[model samples]
Target: IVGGYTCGANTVPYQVSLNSGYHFCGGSLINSQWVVSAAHCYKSGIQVRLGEDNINVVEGNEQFISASKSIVHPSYNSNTLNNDIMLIKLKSAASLNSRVASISLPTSCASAGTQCLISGWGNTKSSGTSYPDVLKCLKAPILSDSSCKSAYPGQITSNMFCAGYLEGGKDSCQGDSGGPVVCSGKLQGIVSWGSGCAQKNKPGVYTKVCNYVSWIKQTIASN
Candidate 1:
């Protein structure tokens, strides 16, 4: 979270906690058992926890599901972090209830300056080692390609986007990668990386989900 706060329990039903033996990333429940996250977060033997507001302990509302399969985009570039999105198939379908639900994908990209919501259990600040025990959220606005490029130069790509403040102190931090960035109630971005947590004028970069809808469809079919 870093510059975020705890959101309402079950408010973000599509949210899922990714655990690589421990809390590591955030993902969105796209369907009963399919999750969308950053490809960089994919690792063998990872677990997905659903319907939980708090991650410190297991709750009755939570569903601890194993990854039936982890699909990272074939063309994903680790160095540039382009095509950073991934799909995770849950071992068991998540039960549809008030506490567990899925989010819809975007038909088009969210425009620049669009205020969006992002959530995670990442570090509480740029240099902090400890993450919040509970899920945390923040309202951030998407930055234009030019604006983001000024901060990242040629490093930003068409397959990626940026969102955050030009000033410091209100952006995603370490351990928040792969979290959902919801714009106008639809899935738009996946938290990928940043120069540092909430740095001045250096907005956070994200994987543009709308750019790979076809790939997502094809990948899910194969999986």
Candidate 2:
């Protein structure tokens, strides 16, 4: 299951599914022709199942978009988990609907201490099992570059953003990687890492979207 907050109390969340049993990390619809997600989640043959509450319901409500190609950030390093971002080009454009709307990307990121939202299918509790049929979300406070650098030392590069509860018990877990960290209703970061889910003195680290503006613009422009 995935977790996130609804715009209102009455609003419902959506989920993505794959034919295989692998996890479906969060994804953002950049436009009718493309979707953004994590590099690690990309497979040779993968289908993006969007606009659904339940995975089993795959009829008219679920939109299946086949990916034509995938591009992972050239600098991505799986060892340190650096540059984990990726973009998926769809074979055809998606028909926009209530459940499948494009999310805006931040042209410029806000300063540190800004609040953001994160959603995913990760474990609600640390070291626990992944959710089966629900989307979960949490609010986090952005950490300053200096504060994050001081805490993590050399690990805090300009390409990363840090946010989460300093007191613990609230954070993105294992399966949450690749999801979004949104602020002001704009995509600002992509969930990357943390020591573990909600560990003390450790906050969720994300790929700073601001740092990739040029690459994103060039990629989208060329395609």
Candidate 3:
């Protein structure tokens, strides 16, 4: 049977969820009151479920947070996936638990070639289907700025970071957007784009978290 929110073998410290019945990508908790996800995940009817693994079966320790307001980066360009980050303000602060803790945003993210980890409920294989009820994660090396620039010349900017296997076959797929890219226990980037799941020479694009610190602070302050 396909269960909802099955825990991974080795789970990361934080959890993120889409609205009930929605099939959007992932997100990461940045604070007791805030979550950082892709702007594209801000579609109508989206909710964030935290602190629980099994939505249908997990008992008593989950927080279903209805987003009170969404703050998409004003510079976000959906077409190019630039400035694709967004902040979700929970209607009420969620009570933290053993299964739920806020992830720290990095003060400084390293440039390309840095190792990072990405997690989501996305597909495992490039051509495979999405997992019915479980989240998955993969570790990848950050691409050098020059390397990414070569692939996406004139487009790879300072606000973006890239990662993935150059030879392909493993990557965050269609449903993995808005997920976390962690490095040194801090959130360094947000899953944004890729040419195709695990395609060779096509690295996954992400929002550079460090560049948005001020905007995130202001957005949180205004909320």
Candidate 4:
């Protein structure tokens, strides 16, 4: 994450790293057997690494769970980045602990100006390949829908909301997609897209998690 600091070990117990052979995206464990992530980060043979704080080195408190099923939103629009959420069914349930646990999903939507924390192993620089070995976090506030729409004219939608500094500083960068955007101790958003890495007037856009609570529950129940 750009303009962020390394997270304390196990502080973000619900955070996870999506990997095939390498860390590609981030996700949040919703239950012992389910994970919430972004559809855009989907890839075959993804292994969910739980209890991970540092991606480069083995911390010994990690759980690598393979995905048995991956279900993307029915109407995920790639062009507009609408409904960019996804659910992954784990092959087996995770063993919950202080270092490995599920995070609660939001029962209600977060409003504009809500302070939130976003964490990931995404790029530390504004551009190029400089990802952090340890997980990093940034404190960014959710922007109003109107403010986001104005920032990226004809691009913002109800399914998406923007966060971070409009003046350009802090944000979740590349490889951070599908990561958690937590507010009030609940999973509120999913890192989705943006124009650039913390660029002026180009805040990070996320999937509105509250809007998909029903979908997430239904998918988990039926799967």
Candidate 5:
């Protein structure tokens, strides 16, 4: 995350890393067995690691579990990047503790101008590659749907929204997809796509998590 600092130990307990022998995407632990992430991160043989802060170090508070199932939103469109949400069920449930916990899903939709958090082990440099070993976080403001549409010009769909500085300099980047965009301590969004890392009038786009509450519940209940 550009323009943010590394997260402290256990500060973001709900954050998890999606790995295939190495961290590639970030996700939120929504329950003992389920994790919410972006559809683009879906793949076979994914290992979910919770209570992770520094990926390069062997942190004791970590839990490694393989994904037993992965369910991407049925209407997910890779071309438009619409409905870019997914759920992952672990082979075994995670053991919740001070350093490992689940984050509550949003009860209502997040409005424009809401100050929220965007975090991940994404690129620290917007122009070049600089992935942080520790998770990085940035406090960004949710932009209005009108503004988002104006910025992307017909790319912002109902299932997607934007958050970050309009003037630029702070946003979630590569290696951070599926990470949390938390508002009021609730999971409101997940990094999905963007025009660039952090550019003027081109804020990072996120999957509108509140729009998927029913889907998440029904999918989990049936599966």
Candidate 6:
């Protein structure tokens, strides 16, 4: 959570913490039982922790469910970071409450320069191991494909997009991957990767959500 702040409880209720004995990544609750996150974040021991704002405290609002299955996009490329999305099926459906609900998926792709919200419990610095107990959030403006391409030429593609501050010091950090990047109150992207945390001219890249809405629906329905 480089250049981010502590988020209020339930500020982003759809948020879920992917845990593997510890916080591994962030995810978005898309439905009663469906959790969307980065394909790279999926692993054998991953479990979903819902309705939780603080990772340190276990209270009545939180629900812990083991991830029964992880369905990564067939074309996901670890090297290129293309199609970097995955769906986690819960063993049992989530019990929605005031502090727990699903987020809305994007109907249209967000345009360049849209200031979106990104939240997570990731480390603040590249060499830092500080993962916050409470969720942290920051507002990062979306970057155009042209501008992003100039930054990481040939690395970014149509399947991916970029966001963050050009001057640096304000961007998502490691352990933040797979978190939601919401624009205009709708799901837009997932924190995929970056060239070190908040380095100069290196905005964080994300898997564009709108481009694969149909695939998500079909996957959800067929599974």
| Candidate with maximal lDDT | 4
Instruction: Order candidates by TM-score, high to low.
Output: 5, 4, 6, 1, 3, 2
Q: For candidate 4, report its TM-score.
A: 0.98
Kindly report which residue stretches of model 1 are placed more than 4 angstroms away from their true locations once superposed. none
- Candidate 6 stretches with Cα past 4 Å from truth are none
TM-score of 6: 0.97
Per-residue lDDT tens digits for candidate 3, residues 1-223, read 0111334622664658777486477788988889999987777666787764544455555678788878888998887778899988888887876677888888887766777778777655666565545566678888887777776777787889788777777677777788888988889988887777787888788889999988888888878
Model 2 backbone overlap count: 10
Query: What TM-score would each prediction reach against the true structure?
Result: 0.96, 0.87, 0.90, 0.98, 0.98, 0.97
Better of 3 and 5 by TM-score: 5
So what's the TM-score on candidate 1? Answer: 0.96
Q: List model 1 lDDT by residue over 142-223, tens digit each.
A: 9889998899988999988889898878898777889899999899999999888888888889899999888887887777
Q: Order the candidates by lDDT, highest first — what do you get? A: 4, 5, 6, 1, 3, 2
Task: Give the Å shift of residue 141 in candidate 4.
Answer: 0.7
- The CA lDDT of each predicted structure is 0.87, 0.70, 0.76, 0.93, 0.92, 0.91
Report the C-alpha lDDT of model 2 over 123-211, residue by residue, as the tens digit: 66666675645456688889887777766777877778788766677778777767777888788888787887787667788888877
Clashing pairs in 2: 1-131, 1-132, 2-134, 2-135, 2-136, 3-135, 3-136, 3-137, 4-136, 4-137
Query: What lDDT score is found at residue 79 in candidate 4?
Result: 77
Among all windows of 10 consecutive residues in model 2, the one with the lowest summed lDDT is: 6-15
Residue-pair clashes per prediction, in order, are 3, 10, 0, 0, 0, 0
What is the Å distance of residue 164 in model 2 from its true position? 0.8
